[PDB]
Design a protein around this nucleic acid. Sequence first.
DNA 1: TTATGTTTTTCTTATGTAATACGTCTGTAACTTGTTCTTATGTCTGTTATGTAGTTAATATAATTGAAGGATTTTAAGA
DNA 2: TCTTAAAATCGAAGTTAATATAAACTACATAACAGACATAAGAACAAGTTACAGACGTATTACATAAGAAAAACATAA
Length: 70
Amino acid sequence: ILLRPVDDLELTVRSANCLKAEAIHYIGDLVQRTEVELLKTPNLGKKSLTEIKDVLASRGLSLGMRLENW
DNA sequence: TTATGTTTTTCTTATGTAATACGTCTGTAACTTGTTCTTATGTCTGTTATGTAGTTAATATAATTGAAGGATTTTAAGA
DNA sequence: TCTTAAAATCGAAGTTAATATAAACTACATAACAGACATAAGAACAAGTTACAGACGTATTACATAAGAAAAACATAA
């Protein structure tokens, strides 16, 4: 699922309002958005990164995706 | 030959130095809760349309409506 | 027992889409329409509370290194 807006991720209000500021609107950014850079962002800890990765894993996706052109 | 002052060395402690681990403060969010303004609606009331009941005094005094090349068979009523 | 009147029936589908003449007035009660008001339902704004997350700040732990103190050895004088 690389064709959905991030708001369709069923993300909680905290994660949605955080990731909205980083101009991250499609999963294609997030699948290669590195774990470290995701952790550096304001208001995003390990226990929320866990749920982000869990929602990704439910729909096949995950972080750490070497990828292709746009 | 031996006692003693000295100097260097090693052990001991002290301030800093850092690493990882874990608690506090604070910033956002879920959950309610009170207050005020707005709105659709149910209900009351006045006015007009309408639907019903009644009355009318030359005299007048036993329908109508078609219906029209039907044959064949069965079964009740008359005699 | 013989006429004689009634009674009943007469293939399927398919199609096959209206007619169409002919008293007045008055009084009264009832239903319907329109306007306005109050009520129940609804929406928006702000506030309290209860908790969890996030990254910072505290305490536990293991030390590096340099200053200070004790001691052993050495050289010297009586």
